[PDB]
Design a protein around this ligand. Structure first.
Ligand SMILES: *[C@@H]1O[C@H](CO)[C@@H](O[C@@H]2O[C@H](CO)[C@@H](O[C@@H]3O[C@H](CO)[C@@H](O)[C@H](O)[C@@H]3O)[C@H](O)[C@H]2NC(C)=O)[C@H](O)[C@H]1NC(C)=O
Ligand SMILES: *[C@@H]1O[C@H](CO)[C@@H](O[C@@H]2O[C@H](CO)[C@@H](O)[C@H](O)[C@H]2NC(C)=O)[C@H](O)[C@H]1NC(C)=O
Ligand SMILES: *[C@@H]1O[C@H](CO)[C@@H](O[C@@H]2O[C@H](CO)[C@@H](O)[C@H](O)[C@H]2NC(C)=O)[C@H](O)[C@H]1NC(C)=O
Ligand SMILES: *[C@@H]1O[C@H](CO)[C@@H](O[C@@H]2O[C@H](CO)[C@@H](O)[C@H](O)[C@H]2NC(C)=O)[C@H](O)[C@H]1NC(C)=O
Ligand SMILES: *[C@@H]1O[C@H](CO)[C@@H](O[C@@H]2O[C@H](CO)[C@@H](O)[C@H](O)[C@H]2NC(C)=O)[C@H](O)[C@H]1NC(C)=O
Ligand SMILES: *[C@@H]1O[C@H](CO)[C@@H](O)[C@H](O)[C@H]1NC(C)=O
Ligand SMILES: *[C@@H]1O[C@H](CO)[C@@H](O)[C@H](O)[C@H]1NC(C)=O
Ligand SMILES: *[C@@H]1O[C@H](CO)[C@@H](O)[C@H](O)[C@H]1NC(C)=O
Ligand SMILES: *[C@@H]1O[C@H](CO)[C@@H](O)[C@H](O)[C@H]1NC(C)=O
Ligand SMILES: *[C@@H]1O[C@H](CO)[C@@H](O)[C@H](O)[C@H]1NC(C)=O
Ligand SMILES: *[C@@H]1O[C@H](CO)[C@@H](O)[C@H](O)[C@H]1NC(C)=O
Ligand SMILES: *[C@@H]1O[C@H](CO)[C@@H](O)[C@H](O)[C@H]1NC(C)=O
Ligand SMILES: *[C@@H]1O[C@H](CO)[C@@H](O)[C@H](O)[C@H]1NC(C)=O
Ligand SMILES: *[C@@H]1O[C@H](CO)[C@@H](O)[C@H](O)[C@H]1NC(C)=O
Lengths: 700, 483
């Protein structure tokens, strides 16, 4: 029936109506979600009176039995969400003292005219959301001493009187939720009745400028820290709008989904302690230097989708004036993702002495070509992470990134760059660590491309149509500290031997979809290129979908630290022996959708010793003893992880074993199983010795 | 002292008869093991599963054909190097060496590889003919010794010191060769032990292995023109295979040891020096110079017919007619029925002592003639199981005819020549012609029908056989003298 694990009772999706009694009596968790209980009989909980938490959500209870709280004195978490509790009485929770968390997320409660929260002095979290409450009054006198989280969202509250909040005389309230309620007016002195207010949420509250102005004046002389006005009707902000918030020590402010037409000058001046600011998903048309005045302690700011939309009917581009963020000296994280700014001006980012993280993905629709004078504003800022994906970049000028000396992570991926990599573009990046050039249109490598950047550790060339890679010396040679190198979907037919030489720090290598069949097989200039010469610290290796039909012996020599090999979607059929001898620390090996026919010990011994997981489905095995006897004997005994073992492991040959699973293959009727090898030699020796001895004896 | 000599010669006769029985049982066990292993290897190699799964790219048909050719063509070199070799080793010693070569062929079947199975086949083809030659010489000389001891006991002074028998050792040779050939034919049934107990339960019914058979019986066009690719329903476990082959090797070694222990010694060092006094340069040409004999020129077709009919009973019947209706499930039954028929005809011909010599011989051939008629017009349907007793009927009749003809040939060849070198020479020539007949029938495979040649040969030998007897009564007078 109900699943029991460690002091829990998973009795959810079973469609049970009555109270089960087969659960152990030393249990402390009861999960009854998505059931059809009508009520909770306070007589059947005697057997497991040591219940700690109770979960009776997603049901249809109409009334709660007060005895339910005195017969189990260990009840701390009570949860009645999505039930049909009609009215709450006075004596319902009058015996319930050990209560800590009460969840009434949906009961359609309209009016409460009693003091039900008088004895639950240990209550911490209260939830009366998605109900029909019209007033925040929960009683007459001061109660709920240890109340910290009170949720009253999705109600029909129309006013916040000062008398209906007096029960919070000295209760350290931490989080208060009044979202999804159309409040029309705020009574004076209502928030002052609360002892301590830390967080306050009014998401989708349908406020106006005058409404939030009166709220800000009401929210004076309190300890509020986090404020959220998301999904609101705040069309425009003014200086007097946020005038009330100057006295309190505000920490986090949220303005999201307000459709803000513009920001008034100095509207954020009265707030000096703002640290986290959110302007996501607005329609700001103009920015001004005086707009952001007064934000000295600002450290977190996001402008994602904050500007004017595309507007196909009428072409409009939001313009930002120079010195817009000069007052923000303490800013650390700045984000303007998915914007419609035309380009970067000369002094847009001037004044940010402490800017560290900046994300500019899809911000500029007409940037196209970068210039050395484009990033001049960010010269005095020690940037650590910069993002330029989805920017439709096409060209890069000389010395564009020279101003950004302390840059560490740089992203140029998902662009249409069509230029040759001369090498002068990376000038000034002494402390750069990661470069993202994936999904670019067309590039050309050069010998001095990455010479100015020896400290590089990560480089990505996924889908770039790389060319001129086979040149001497190797362009990747100065990358002494290169750790992760990723080049896939380049279709590079010819690769020189000197490439990836001296790369001792190389650990991860990706080589998918580059067509390496012609280079290895039997090369016309000579032999196998074996570009994996001194990559000793290589850990993860991938060579999938290159169409290789054979593996030359000696390419994996001196590869001790190698852990993972991916050779799927290849055309290999015959494997030379002693190719995986150095692969003694192998963990994962993938050979799927190949032409592998036979798996032999002399080839697969060393790797299979400590192999962890293996994938070899979609392969045409030859179901013969000499072919797969050791393979079946190993896969039978070993405990390594095999994915889709009895499903996608089939044998094409012989015709008698066509479409037969490999696991059902029997190796008892094989030559290596029976000892006739030794029996033949011993019988032949004995018989020859007997015949010869008796013939030489009886002759003489 | 009369009764002491009585006991002495009684022990001598008992030793003679026990060595005769030992040689007979050794022939039985050796030939049974050889036929059983050969049949098991030929059947286990006619499928795709056991060929590709166990071996794969080792070329099973190629090595099988090479084994067959090495067994069938080596008798030529065997004849070329048998007389001097038999007189070197001895009568019983070549017997022992040939049994050892047979056991070697059985031993090299475990691993089954070119360089270990092809030399075994060559040695088997080299030892097959001299084995039978020395066997016949040994059994006939021991019958002669039995008769001479009996007539020395019954006639002390009336029996001459030189030339005791004078063509009168027939009653003591008939009863020996009859039991010898009955045991040699019971070997054919003993060979069917591994198939019945281990191989008969691993192949499926005839409804699938006999599908592509549109013409059988008189319309064969080969040994097996129509047959399925595979015949085993399941792969045989290697443990049962090694068990049955170890039992075969054990019974072969038991036959080896019992032959060595109960054959004694019948070479007689005095007669050994006598035969050595002939020389080594003239013994090589004497069997070839013996072509001028009046009896061999007419008895050679008889040997050819004996070989032809024995190979027809071995393969021409089991794989030509018995495979028509039923598959390989009742082939061993037909083989053991043929063996019991031959064993019964052995004593049936033993009972033919009062009648003169060449009475049943041609009659036996005549039997084949009658059988040949039933083997010419009647053609059984492959896809029916109506009449199955007729197969066992013809098998028993062919066994009767074959055993009668073989024992008659043996007794006539032992009676016409009484000298030791004559015995060895005539037995060698007869067995060489039999081996040539076997080799010709081997070349006679994949042919439309071998019945017309068989019947013409039986009609050429009946008249010929009678012909030889019609001149011995009129005193023609001719005998090769090469002392
Ligand atoms: C610069 O910004 C871009 C875009 O915000 C960052 O791209 C993000 O890269 C991660 C890592 O691949 C993506 O996570 C993965 O997404 C794929 C779907 O594409 C999903 O299947 C994976 O399970 C994983 O979640 C992430 O989606 C992607 N962002 C977007 C919007 O697609 C990039 O990482 C940034 N550069 C940095 C931080 O250096
Ligand atoms: C950005 O690059 C341009 C072009 O490379 C620089 O323009 C040069 O300016 C100097 C003095 O202002 C002139 O003497 C050159 O003739 C200009 N063109 C060149 C060098 O090709 C511009 O100065 C660079 N910006 C900065 C800040 O260095
Ligand atoms: C950016 O710098 C590169 C330096 O690599 C310049 O390319 C060189 O231009 C000179 C001028 O003739 C050539 O002699 C060199 O062979 C070029 N080097 C390479 C590697 O191609 C490039 O001209 C500069 N571009 C700008 C706009 O200043
Ligand atoms: C490659 O990485 C190593 C390891 O960090 C760098 O060696 C450091 O160099 C700095 C600068 O002199 C020293 O302060 C550190 O003590 C060095 N660390 C070690 C472990 O030796 C090396 O400089 C890097 N190479 C490049 C070209 O950036
Ligand atoms: C050997 O026997 C098998 C069956 O035991 C034959 O396979 C059959 O082939 C026909 C040809 O159309 C199919 O209709 C049947 O479904 C097959 N039976 C199976 C697969 O069980 C095979 O053709 C025979 N081969 C010969 C040469 O006679
Ligand atoms: C009760 O179970 C549901 C679904 O299995 C789960 O979402 C919920 O977190 C569980 N609650 C407790 C208190 O275990
Ligand atoms: C709460 O539970 C404890 C533990 O059983 C019990 O002793 C106490 O009486 C209960 N009620 C309280 C503390 O009001
Ligand atoms: C909280 O206020 C009540 C009266 O409103 C008082 O009785 C109680 O002592 C106060 N508690 C603290 C800790 O000040
Ligand atoms: C207020 O916001 C800060 C920053 O996001 C967070 O660390 C803190 O936990 C929040 N406090 C509350 C009560 O939500
Ligand atoms: C609010 O705090 C300020 C600063 O201490 C003080 O001047 C003012 O009188 C306070 N107002 C109220 C209503 O407490
Ligand atoms: C802000 O100042 C600019 C420049 O003086 C002016 O054009 C704009 O109208 C001002 N905005 C407000 C809301 O006062
Ligand atoms: C193999 O499976 C076990 C058990 O599911 C798991 O703990 C382990 O992480 C797996 N290893 C790999 C390499 O997937
Ligand atoms: C090997 O296979 C057999 C039958 O498929 C199975 O019973 C046995 O458990 C397997 N070996 C191991 C170690 O699981
Ligand atoms: C199997 O063989 C028997 C032989 O008597 C026959 O009667 C039966 O019809 C066959 N079954 C088939 C061909 O399905």
């Amino acid at each position: 029936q109900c699943t029991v694990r460690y002091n829990v009772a998973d009795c959810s999706h079973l469609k049970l109506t009555h109270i089960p009694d087969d659960l152990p009596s030393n249990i402390t968790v009861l999960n009854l979600t998505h059931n059809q209980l009508r009520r909770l009989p306070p007589t059947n909980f005697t057997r497991y009176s040591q219940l700690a938490i109770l979960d009776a959500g997603f049901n249809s209870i109409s009334k709660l039995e007060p005895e339910l709280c005195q017969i189990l004195p260990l009840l701390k978490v009570l949860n009645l969400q999505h039930n049909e509790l009609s009215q709450i009485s006075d004596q319902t929770f009058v015996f319930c003292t050990n209560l800590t968390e009460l969840d009434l997320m949906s009961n359609s409660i309209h009016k409460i005219k009693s003091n039900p929260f008088k004895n639950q002095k240990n209550l911490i979290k209260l939830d009366l959301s998605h109900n029909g409450l019209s007033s925040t009054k929960l009683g007459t006198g001061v109660q709920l001493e240890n109340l910290q989280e009170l949720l009253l969202a999705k109600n029909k509250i129309l006013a916040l009187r000062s008398e209906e909040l007096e029960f919070l005389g000295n209760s350290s309230l931490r989080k208060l939720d009044l979202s999804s309620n159309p409040l029309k007016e705020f009574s004076p002195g209502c928030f002052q009745t609360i002892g301590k207010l830390f967080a306050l949420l009014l998401n989708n509250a349908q406020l106006n400028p005058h409404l939030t102005e009166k709220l800000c004046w009401e929210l004076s002389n309190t300890s509020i820290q986090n404020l959220s006005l998301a999904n609101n009707q705040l069309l425009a902000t003014s200086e007097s709008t946020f005038s009330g918030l100057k006295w309190t020590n505000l920490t986090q402010l949220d303005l999201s989904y307000n459709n803000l037409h513009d920001v008034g000058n100095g509207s954020f001046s009265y707030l000096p302690s703002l640290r986290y600011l959110s302007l996501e998903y607005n329609n700001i048309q103009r920015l001004s230097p005086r707009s952001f005045y007064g934000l000295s302690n600002l450290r977190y700011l996001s402008l994602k989708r904050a500007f004017t939309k595309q507007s196909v009917s009428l072409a409009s581009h939001p313009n930002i004036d120079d010195f817009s963020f000069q007052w923000l000296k303490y800013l650390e994280y700045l984000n303007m993702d998915d914007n419609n700014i035309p380009s970067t001006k000369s002094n847009t980012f001037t004044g940010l002495v402490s800017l560290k993280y900046l994300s500019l993905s899809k911000t500029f629709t007409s940037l196209q070509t970068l210039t050395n004078e484009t990033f001049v504003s960010l010269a005095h800022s020690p940037l650590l992470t910069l993002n330029l994906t989805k920017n439709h970049i096409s060209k890069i000028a000389n010395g564009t990134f020279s101003w950004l000396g302390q840059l560490r992570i740089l992203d140029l991926g998902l662009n249409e760059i069509e230029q040759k990599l001369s090498g002068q573009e990376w000038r000034g990046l002494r402390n750069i660590f990661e470069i993202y050039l994936s999904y670019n249109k067309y590039l050309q490598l050069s010998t001095s491309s990455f010479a100015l950047v020896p400290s590089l550790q990560r480089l990505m060339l996924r889908r770039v149509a790389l060319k001129n890679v086979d040149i001497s010396p190797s362009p990747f040679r100065p990358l002494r500290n290169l750790t992760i190198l990723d080049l896939s979907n380049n279709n590079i037919a010819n690769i020189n031997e000197d490439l990836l030489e001296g790369l001792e720090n190389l650990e991860i290598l990706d080589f998918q979809h580059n067509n390496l069949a012609r280079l290895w097989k039997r090369a016309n200039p000579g032999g196998p290129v074996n570009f994996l010469k001194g990559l000793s610290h290589l850990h993860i290796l991938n060579l999938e979908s290159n169409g290789l039909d054979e593996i030359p012996v000696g390419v994996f020599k001196n590869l001790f630290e190698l852990k993972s090999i991916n050779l799927g979607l290849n055309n290999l059929n015959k494997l030379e022996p002693f190719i995986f001898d150095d692969q003694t620390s192998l963990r994962s090996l993938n050979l799927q959708k190949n032409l592998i026919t036979s798996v032999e010990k002399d080839v697969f011994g060393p790797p299979f010793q400590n192999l962890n997981s293996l994938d070899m489905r979609f392969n045409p095995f030859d179901c013969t003893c000499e072919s797969i006897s050791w393979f079946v004997n190993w896969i039978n005994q070993t405990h390594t992880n095999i994915s889709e073992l009895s499903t996608h492991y089939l044998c094409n040959t012989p015709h008698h074993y066509y479409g037969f699973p490999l696991k059902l293959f029997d190796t008892s009727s094989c030559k290596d199983s029976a000892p006739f090898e030794l029996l033949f030699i011993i019988s032949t020796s004995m018989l020859l010795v007997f015949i010869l001895v008796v013939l030489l004896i009886h002759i003489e | 002292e009369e009764e002491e000599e009585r006991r002495y010669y009684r022990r001598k006769r008992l030793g003679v008869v026990k060595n005769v029985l030992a040689a007979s049982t050794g022939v039985t066990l050796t030939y049974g093991v050889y036929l059983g292993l050969l049949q098991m290897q030929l059947i286990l190699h006619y499928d795709e599963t056991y060929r590709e799964v166990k071996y794969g790219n080792m070329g099973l048909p190629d090595i099988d054909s090479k084994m067959l050719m090495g067994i069938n063509v080596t008798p030529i070199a065997a004849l070329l190097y048998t007389p001097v070799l038999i007189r070197f080793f001895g009568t019983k010693w070549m017997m022992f060496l040939a049994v050892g070569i047979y056991a070697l062929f059985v031993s090299t079947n475990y691993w089954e590889r070119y360089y270990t199975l092809v030399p075994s086949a060559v040695a088997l083809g080299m030892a097959i003919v001299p084995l039978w030659a020395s066997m016949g010489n040994y059994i006939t000389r021991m019958s002669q010794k039995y008769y001479e001891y009996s007539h020395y006991k019954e006639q002390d002074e009336q029996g001459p010191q030189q030339r005791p028998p004078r063509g009168s050792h027939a009653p003591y040779l008939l009863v020996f060769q009859a039991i010898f050939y009955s045991f040699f034919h019971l070997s054919f049934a003993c060979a069917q032990l591994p198939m019945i107990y281990f191989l008969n339960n691993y192949l499926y019914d005839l409804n699938h292995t006999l599908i592509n058979v549109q013409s059988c019986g008189t319309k064969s066009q080969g040994i097996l023109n129509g047959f399925n690719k595979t015949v085993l329903r399941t792969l045989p476990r290697s443990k049962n295979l090694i068990v049955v082959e170890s039992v075969l090797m054990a019974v072969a070694f038991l036959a080896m040891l019992m032959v060595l222990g109960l054959c004694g010694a019948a070479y007689r060092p005095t007669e050994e020096i006598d035969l050595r006094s002939v020389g080594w340069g003239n013994i090589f040409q004497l069997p070839f110079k013996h072509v001028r004999d009046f009896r061999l020129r007419h008895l050679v077709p008889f040997f050819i017919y004996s070989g032809f009919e024995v190979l027809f009973a071995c393969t021409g019947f089991a794989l030509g007619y018995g495979v028509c209706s039923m598959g390989l499930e009742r082939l061993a039954y037909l083989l053991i029925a043929y063996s019991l028929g031959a064993s019964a005809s052995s004593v049936l011909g033993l009972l033919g002592l009062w009648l003169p010599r060449s009475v049943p011989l041609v009659a036996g051939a005549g039997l084949h003639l009658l059988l040949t008629l039933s083997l010419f017009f009647w053609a059984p349907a492959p896809r029916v199981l109506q009449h199955s007793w007729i197969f066992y009927f013809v098998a028993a009749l062919w066994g009767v005819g074959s055993a009668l003809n073989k024992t008659g040939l043996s007794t006539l060849l032992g009676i016409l020549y009484e000298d030791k070198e004559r015995q060895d020479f005539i037995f060698t020539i007869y067995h060489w012609w039999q081996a040539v007949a076997i080799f010709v029938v081997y070349l006679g495979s994949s042919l439309p029908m071998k019945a017309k040649l068989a019947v013409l040969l039986v009609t050429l030998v009946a008249a010929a056989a009678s012909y030889l007897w019609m001149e011995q009564k009129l005193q023609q007078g001719l005998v090769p003298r090469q002392p």
